[PDB]
Amino acid sequence: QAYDGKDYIALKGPENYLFQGRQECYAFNGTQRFLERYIYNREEFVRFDSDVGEFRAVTELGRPDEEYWNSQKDILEEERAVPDRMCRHNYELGGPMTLQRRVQPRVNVSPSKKGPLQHHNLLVCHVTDFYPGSIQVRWFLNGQEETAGVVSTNLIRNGDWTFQILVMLEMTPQQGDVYTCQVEHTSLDSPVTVEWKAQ
Amino acid sequence: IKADHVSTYAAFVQTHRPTGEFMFEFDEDEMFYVDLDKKETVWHLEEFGQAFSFEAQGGLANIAILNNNLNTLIQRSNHTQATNDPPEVTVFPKEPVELGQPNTLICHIDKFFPPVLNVTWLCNGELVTEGVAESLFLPRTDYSFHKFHYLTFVPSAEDFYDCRVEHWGLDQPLLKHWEA
Numbered sequence: 001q002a003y004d005g006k007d008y009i010a011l012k013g014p015e016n017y018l019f020q021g022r023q024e025c026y027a028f029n030g031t032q033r034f035l036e037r038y039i040y041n042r043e044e045f046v047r048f049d050s051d052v053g054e055f056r057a058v059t060e061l062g063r064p065d066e067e068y069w070n071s072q073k074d075i076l077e078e079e080r081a082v083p084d085r086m087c088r089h090n091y092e093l094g095g096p097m098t099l100q101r102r103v104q105p106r107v108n109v110s111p112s113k114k115g116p117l118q119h120h121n122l123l124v125c126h127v128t129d130f131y132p133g134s135i136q137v138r139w140f141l142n143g144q145e146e147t148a149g150v151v152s153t154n155l156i157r158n159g160d161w162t163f164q165i166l167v168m169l170e171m172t173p174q175q176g177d178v179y180t181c182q183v184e185h186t187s188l189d190s191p192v193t194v195e196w197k198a199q
Numbered sequence: 200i201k202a203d204h205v206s207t208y209a210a211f212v213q214t215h216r217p218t219g220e221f222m223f224e225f226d227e228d229e230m231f232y233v234d235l236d237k238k239e240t241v242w243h244l245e246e247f248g249q250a251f252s253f254e255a256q257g258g259l260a261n262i263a264i265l266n267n268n269l270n271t272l273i274q275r276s277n278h279t280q281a282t283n284d285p286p287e288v289t290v291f292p293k294e295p296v297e298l299g300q301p302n303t304l305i306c307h308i309d310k311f312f313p314p315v316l317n318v319t320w321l322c323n324g325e326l327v328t329e330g331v332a333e334s335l336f337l338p339r340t341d342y343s344f345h346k347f348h349y350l351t352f353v354p355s356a357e358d359f360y361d362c363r364v365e366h367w368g369l370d371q372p373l374l375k376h377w378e379a
C-alpha cells in the first residue's frame with residue numbers, strides 16, 4: 001500500500017521563473033506507458049517516452065539534454081524500467097477502491113428560473129455528486145423519448161472527487177404533460193428516474 | 200495516448216509564493232500532495248490516507264532537483280520570463296439550490312499562468328473568511344494551471360456573492376458574481 005515515486009534527473013548547466021515536471025503513467029489493457037516531461041515555464045523542452053525508449057528534445061532548449069542523457073546507459077535503463085516497476089506497482093496497489101471507485105448521483109428536476117436571460121423555456125435535470133465521470137441522461141415526455149431540444153453543460157469537475165452535470169430539455173408544456181429525466185451511471189444497478197409535471 | 204487510467208506526479212518550483220508544489224493525481228483528481236513546510240504527505244480523501252501511504256521525503260528530494268533544474272534553465276534561457284495568461288472564472292453551487300438549506304459555492308479558476316493568485320470570497324460586498332477551503336494549484340496538460348475555491352453557505356434570497364480574483368495577466372481584479 002505505499003506508492004512508489006521516482007527522482008527526476010538533475011540537468012547540467014514582477015520577476016518570476018518556473019520549472020515543472022510530469023511523471024505520467026498510462027494504463028491500458030494490461031500495459032503501462034511512462035512519460036517524463038521537463039518544462040520551463042509553459043515550454044516542454046525534453047521528454048522520455050517509454051514507447052520511444054530514449055530522451056527526445058521537444059524544443060531546441062532541450063537539444064543539449066537529449067544528447068547527454070542518451071549516452072548515459074544507467075539512466076536510460078532506469079527510465080526504461082519505470083513501466084514495469086513504478087507504474088505497474090502503483091496501478092496494482094490501488095485495488096477496487098481506486099480503480100473502481102463509485103459514488104452515486106443525486107438527481108433533481110426543476111424548471112429553469114432564468115428564461116429572461118436564456119430566452120428559452122428549459123426544464124433542468126441537475127445531476128450531482130457522482131463518480132466516475134461517465135454518465136448518460138435521457139429525457140421522456142409522456143413516456144416517449146425526446147431527443148430533440150436537449151442541451152447540456154460540460155461534465156463539471158467539482159475538485160473534491162465528484163462531478164455534476166446539468167441536462168436541459170427545451171419544452172412547450174401542455175397541461176397534463178409528464179416529463180421524466182432518466183439517469184444511467186455505473187454506480188447504480190438500475191436507472192434513476194425523476195418526474196416533473198406541468199402544473 | 201490510449202488509457203483506461205492516467206496516474207501522474209506533477210510538481211513545480213518558482214520564484215514567488217508558492218515557491219514549490221509536489222502532487223499526485225489519478226484521472227485528473229488530486230490524490231495526495233506533500234506539504235513542503237510540514238514535510239508531510241497530505242491525502243485528499245480520508246479513506247485513502249487510511250489505506251495507502253507515500254514517503255514525503257521523495258517529494259522533498261524532487262523539489263530540490265527541480266530547484267536545481269530551475270537555476271539551470273533560467274541561465275540557459277537567458278532569464279526568459281513567460282507571458283502572464285489570465286484566468287477564466289466560473290462560480291457554481293455544488294448542490295441544487297434550496298433556500299435555507301446548507302450548500303457549497305465553488306469558484307473554479309482556470310487556464311492561468313503563472314500559479315500566483317489572490318482569491319477571496321465576498322458576501323454582500325464584504326470579505327468572507329470562514330467556511331472557506333481551496334485546492335492546490337492543479338496542473339493542466341497545456342502547462343497552465345487551475346484552482347478551486349470553496350465556500351460553505353446557506354442560500355438566502357437577499358445575499359449576493361462574488362469570487363474576487365487577482366492575477367498578473369489581469370488589468371484589475373476580476374469579480375465573478377453569483378446569486379440565488
Ligand SMILES: *[C@@H]1O[C@H](CO[C@@H]2O[C@H](CO)[C@@H](O)[C@H](O)[C@H]2NC(C)=O)[C@@H](O[C@@H]2O[C@H](CO)[C@@H](O)[C@H](O)[C@H]2NC(C)=O)[C@H](O[C@@H]2O[C@H](CO)[C@@H](O)[C@H](O)[C@H]2NC(C)=O)[C@H]1NC(C)=O
Pocket residue numbers: 029030
Ligand atoms: C488487449 O490485449 C490483448 C493482449 O494479449 C497480447 O498478446 C500479444 C501477443 O501477440 C502481445 O504483444 C501483448 O503484449 C499481449 N498482452 C497480454 C497482456 O496478453 C490483445 O489481444 C491479443 O492480440 C494479439 C494481436 O496483437 C493476438 O494475436 C492475441 O492472440 C490476442 N490475445 C488474446 C488473448 O485474445 C488485445 O488485442 C486486440 O484484440 C484482438 C486480438 O485479440 C485484435 O482484434 C486486435 O488486433 C487487438 N487490437 C489492437 C488495437 O491492437 C488488446 N486489446 C486492445 C484494444 O488493444
Ligand SMILES: *[C@@H]1O[C@H](CO)[C@@H](O[C@@H]2O[C@H](CO)[C@@H](O)[C@H](O)[C@H]2NC(C)=O)[C@H](O)[C@H]1NC(C)=O
Pocket residue numbers: 315316317365366367
Ligand atoms: C496578491 O496580493 C499581494 C499583496 O497585496 C500583492 O503583492 C504586493 O504587490 C504590491 C503592489 O503591486 C507590491 O508593491 C508589494 O511589494 C507586494 N507585496 C508583497 C509582499 O509582495 C500581489 O501582487 C498579489 N498577487 C497577484 C497575483 O495579484
Ligand code: NA
Pocket residue numbers: 238239240241253254255
Ligand atoms: Na508523511
